[PDB]
Design a protein around this ligand. Sequence first.
Ligand SMILES: N[C@H]1[C@@H](OP(=O)(O)O)O[C@H](CO)[C@@H](O)[C@@H]1O
Ligand SMILES: N[C@H]1[C@@H](OP(=O)(O)O)O[C@H](CO)[C@@H](O)[C@@H]1O
Ligand SMILES: N[C@H]1[C@@H](OP(=O)(O)O)O[C@H](CO)[C@@H](O)[C@@H]1O
Ligand SMILES: [Mg+2]
Ligand SMILES: [Mg+2]
Lengths: 441, 441, 441
Amino acid sequence: SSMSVVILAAGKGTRMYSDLPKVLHPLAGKPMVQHVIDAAMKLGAQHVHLVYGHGGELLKKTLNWVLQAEQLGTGHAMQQAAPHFADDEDILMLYGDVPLISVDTLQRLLAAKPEGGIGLLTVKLDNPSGYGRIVRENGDVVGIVEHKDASDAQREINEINTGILVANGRDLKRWLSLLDNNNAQGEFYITDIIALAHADGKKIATVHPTRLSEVEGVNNRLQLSALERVFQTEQAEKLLLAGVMLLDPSRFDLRGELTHGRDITIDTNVIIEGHVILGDRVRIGTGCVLKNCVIGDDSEISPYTVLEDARLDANCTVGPFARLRPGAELAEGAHVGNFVEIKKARLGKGSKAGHLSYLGDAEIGAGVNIGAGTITCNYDGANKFKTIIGDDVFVGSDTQLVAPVTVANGATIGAGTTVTRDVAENELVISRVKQVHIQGW
Amino acid sequence: SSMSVVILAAGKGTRMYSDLPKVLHPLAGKPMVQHVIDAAMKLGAQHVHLVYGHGGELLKKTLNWVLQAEQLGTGHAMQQAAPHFADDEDILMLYGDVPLISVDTLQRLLAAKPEGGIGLLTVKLDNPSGYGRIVRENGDVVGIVEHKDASDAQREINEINTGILVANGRDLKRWLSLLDNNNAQGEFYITDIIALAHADGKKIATVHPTRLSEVEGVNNRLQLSALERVFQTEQAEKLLLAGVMLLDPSRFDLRGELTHGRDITIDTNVIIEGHVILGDRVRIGTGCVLKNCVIGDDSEISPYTVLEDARLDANCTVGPFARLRPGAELAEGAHVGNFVEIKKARLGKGSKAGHLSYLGDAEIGAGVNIGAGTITCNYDGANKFKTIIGDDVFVGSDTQLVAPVTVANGATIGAGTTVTRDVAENELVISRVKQVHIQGW
Amino acid sequence: SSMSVVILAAGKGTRMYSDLPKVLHPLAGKPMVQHVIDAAMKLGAQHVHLVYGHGGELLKKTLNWVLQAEQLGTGHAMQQAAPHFADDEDILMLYGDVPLISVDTLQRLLAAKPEGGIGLLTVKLDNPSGYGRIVRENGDVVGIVEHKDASDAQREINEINTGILVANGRDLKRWLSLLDNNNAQGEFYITDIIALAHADGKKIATVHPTRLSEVEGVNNRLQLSALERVFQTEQAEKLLLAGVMLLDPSRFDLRGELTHGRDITIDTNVIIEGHVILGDRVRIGTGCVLKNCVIGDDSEISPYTVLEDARLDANCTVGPFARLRPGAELAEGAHVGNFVEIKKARLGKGSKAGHLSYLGDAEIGAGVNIGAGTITCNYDGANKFKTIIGDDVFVGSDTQLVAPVTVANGATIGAGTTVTRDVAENELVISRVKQVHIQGW
Ligand SMILES: N[C@H]1[C@@H](OP(=O)(O)O)O[C@H](CO)[C@@H](O)[C@@H]1O
Ligand SMILES: N[C@H]1[C@@H](OP(=O)(O)O)O[C@H](CO)[C@@H](O)[C@@H]1O
Ligand SMILES: N[C@H]1[C@@H](OP(=O)(O)O)O[C@H](CO)[C@@H](O)[C@@H]1O
Ligand SMILES: [Mg+2]
Ligand SMILES: [Mg+2]
């Protein structure tokens, strides 16, 4: 049948000690709640109903919005969404702070819901302390008892409520209408709806997650960090099984997506962010950070190199200690060495910038040698200007190129030159500065 | 009552293979024995009696000193300290190589000591092999039997001696006087004092540590490394619960103290040393090392940045690959980029040094742009001299400023300039060097 | 008796997803199969028979070669090697993808082989699923039953076949000749030889490895990564017990050999490759990579320093963010600072290159100060040339030395100089460039 989702995002995240709404805190670079939304979309949800208390502005700025003005609990929260439920759709209840719930588990949950009844996700814990206990009579679920209100006998129950469940909209709206708030907490308890479904003589079927981490909620940053490590380990293991050699999968982080070829080797402490594409036989040395980059076949990134919005073609070498900024592009066989920064600049085929250089806003040809210490002066304090270097140019060490300026093919620039005017094809330019020599200084 | 501590620091650390006395080997940046002293001071010890064998010079240089001339054992060691005990104080016995003993455990130990008797810290191990066994008769402690001298029946005992205990000074001095040395080892066994206390009809009460790591001793560097990881994990978890987001708490080290604000994010492989203070919303990228630094609100430290004795005001950005040395100071909104080293220099509000620069012994104003490749020549081979740069100065790329020299407000320095004489307000200075152009080179 | 080894290297490594033969994939910097060969040589093998299917070219290029033209299984594989066995030697069967098998285990295996019979290495697993089961009758091994062909009763057996075994050559050749291929797989099963040995009334003795990891095979990169971590942890623990202080042994990698002195400290995330030699009291900061280097007593390598084929004498300091390339050599007390690259260059006693410099193909004397920004121009686009700097030379900041060129003892080079001609003893050389000053720019 058809289905929509309600994501509860309206708890108080006091133990996060944060000014950022709890469900916005990221896991693997993505807000927790977005993990949950992604899963919902994968399930084929027709609507996603997001219930919130505060941070509504930032929530909408970041990500069907449903206000819960007073933090009066989950039952009350659902009461707020209930009018938006279709009588003819299934409604899946999820939490914005339970980010690792898997599509497989949810699919099995939807499959297990008995006609007219409820599908309830439960899990058996070694220590169920503090959790809602699943109450069964002769094997069938009839009730949930919260820890606080549970008796000593009930507290021996190990099967507990994850709070994730599915029911038909018409049925759900009915059960929510029958909730009672007259009690020691002054709130409606969502958990009472399973007893209410039972009262109507309807069935509550259960399924279990595959992993405990799937139904773990985040209330503080220690708990978020554990889930971060679980998720990173999962990603790392998939990459290994898919043929990427991670030299230490416990020291690898992916925060986005990695599209990869064959026989790649990634060394320790590499961080991949955004969407990165790696060709065949790429090697990434220790400590590198890549964000939104494309790296061509057989390229080698040496240790402690940082790249963002950069492109390497095949057979390129970069680093160690290089810094590629957005718009940095290396054509086939180009080389960028240590203590070199490239920004919005292209280095043509086989061209080399091996040391202690800044190349910004530059179009550099093929077969070019950029000597150590070369710098493009691309900024006048108001605007930025382009440097153009042709093919087969030799730029001597510690030269400044003062943009806008063009150096034609075949030219040679002497060490220590300040280039302010265009250089013609096959021209040598060199500073003829006079020195004083003083004997016996 | 009143209390003093005896710390035993006189064992042979042969399996450390070190020229540094064993108890001086650090854990989280602090000698093991100093952890123990700190705990003692927290307990309110009136005196700390440190018993040593060798390395006394270095020990005192590093940290009431009590010689044990001949390594004749713990009983003998205590005999050496006994004359310093007051008849009217409690004496707590600790070890310099058991660094994680907690104040809580010790407080409970002091509370459990029966009048006229002994408080003894014991622990139950899955494998008690090699440890002193606690001998009980009808539930009461009467004895300790060392493993070697224990029978097969005794060796089944899992409750073992940690060697940590407390007794009144007068009582202790008596029991120590009654120790016998005529045996297969020629030494007095400290453990005999519990049997001696029993002989006098006094009670020996026991308490247990909360964690096994609290009473683990260090005899080799493998054991020290395990304790280092335990301690770092504890620190990391406290920081997470306190609201600091560590993106991987297994790749975080604190060796000193971290004072922090709210909504801080620290990425993998960060090392914090000395005392570091972080404002709200500070972000620290992967690989950074901070030692004795103050970082203001909303500052961002990019990957692979090293800072020591440095100060950032609010909204500053530094790195990646920047190196801030002692006396480096950034005013609000300042920026230091890649391959820049700052030493005993201040960069004023909104001023920028983005690349490949060395700024030492310099006072730099607000609104200054330091071009790539700029270097302060602060050294003449004997002394060091200051560079002063006013507000709203534009320093062109690859300039050297030869100190002492002053550049006034509003000035502009052309690329490639060697500045040796003061520059006046709103002055442009630029090198007019002649070049040779040779066609067809 | 005398002994030879057969290493099976002819499986299909489909789940590696690699163009490199599976047994060539490295563990700790060394092909898996080379670990196995090393063990064989340590055992005193007279011959090593390597059976292969494909990748024979690359295998021989990388490492008695024995073709198995058709991947028809292990029995068939051994049939191919059998003619090379001496009737009067023991033959040990190993696998190229089981890299951590220990010499101790193998020695015990060889010792346990009964005259005329077989020594078989087996292991007891918590989950034996998918493994060959060891079949015993009244305690004696008579059979091996592969999982697939095993009954439900047989599958309860926890003792499984590692496939590692030893038998006399004459005996082995006989048993291999009697293998039957007429079955649902069309292959000879090596495991049948133990039933065949039993048929002849010979004994099959068993021994067990000390660690499970010793007999773990690699079929995919996830499995290789687990073995990599096991191996690195073993190496790290040995180094700690031997007296090297690793500040985090889970963040330490050795890919080769480390020869070390006393009281060394290595911080987190250090990678040692090739053969590295460290003197006493060397400290290595976080993030460093050392490959084929010799570091003298009391030297300190600061964070994020990369060295290859480099030599430091005693009391040297390098980094942070320094890059030493092959042929880099520092004499006693020399210093290389941040953003400095040294290649095929020697820095003499007490000489300093603290910042933003490139020194290549250079002989630099003692007592030299290399100012920030100094660069050797060692390349003309075709060849490379040497720079020679004498003792007690002061090179001013941002100087280029244009090789070949010699600077004699005692000389001083002014900031910003382009040195193209030899400098005489005690000479000051300095650029006298004229500037334009424009007021009110
Ligand atoms: N300094 C030059 C030298 O580098 P090194 O000798 O350090 O490799 O030659 C390289 C090519 O071989 C050039 O690209 C560098 O500009
Ligand atoms: N090279 C200049 C350029 O940097 P980039 O263009 O690399 O950011 O402009 C920056 C301000 O926008 C200046 O501080 C840098 O000195
Ligand atoms: N810039 C100089 C300064 O460095 P710093 O003042 O940054 O240590 O003096 C050092 C010696 O003291 C010299 O080697 C450096 O060349
Ligand atoms: Mg210059
Ligand atoms: Mg320069």
